Design a protein around this ligand. Sequence first.
Ligand SMILES: COc1cccc2onc(N)c12
Ligand SMILES: NC(=O)c1ccccc1
Length: 134
Amino acid sequence: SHMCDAFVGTWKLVSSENFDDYMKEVGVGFATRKVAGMAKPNMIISVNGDVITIKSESTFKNTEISFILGQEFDEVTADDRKVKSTITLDGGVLVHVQKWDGKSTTIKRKREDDKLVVECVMKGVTSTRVYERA
Ligand SMILES: COc1cccc2onc(N)c12
Ligand SMILES: NC(=O)c1ccccc1
């Protein structure tokens, strides 16, 4: 077993709050905000050795990242930013920091009851996205 065990599986989006405002703060343009905001992604998390893979699949886009904790990687986000990302585990929370163009945003993923709660923060704006097992 490893502690990241509790994240592994297939998850479906069940609620979202403030995501349009988060996207505005990140710099996402109108059309992508509307279509991305409509999406109901599944999140598929797996682990093989030290490598964690997170896939996010929707009618809008299918994305995939694989990474080792603490080891930076380059990521093309669903909104087409080219970012430098680092993901760590802090007290049981996956903490994903994206850097680009002198800006930064942080996405936290945590298990709470039977949910996987995703908190996205850009400056003072937070969006909370709740997933449940598929
Ligand atoms: C991280 O992936 C997403 C985050 C937010 C909305 C999304 O729509 N399609 C996606 N793959 C997606
Ligand atoms: N999984 C999500 O819904 C998500 C939203 C925004 C940024 C990263 C992930």
